[PDB]
Amino acid sequence: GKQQESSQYIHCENCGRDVSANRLAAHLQRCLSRGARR
Ligand SMILES: [Zn+2]
Numbered sequence: 728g729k730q731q732e733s734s735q736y737i738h739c740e741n742c743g744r745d746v747s748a749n750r751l752a753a754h755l756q757r758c759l760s761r762g763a764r765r
Pocket of ligand 1: 744754
């Protein structure tokens with residue numbers, strides 16, 4: 728292994744999705760933006 732980034736998919740609590748923990752914050756920006764629940 729070398730090019731294998733440990734992106735690590737974890738369970739987002741915001742949409743309930745398997746998303747990279749390494750990208751969870753940027754994801755959350757998109758996630759929270761989209762997840763405007765009313
Ligand atoms: Zn999410």
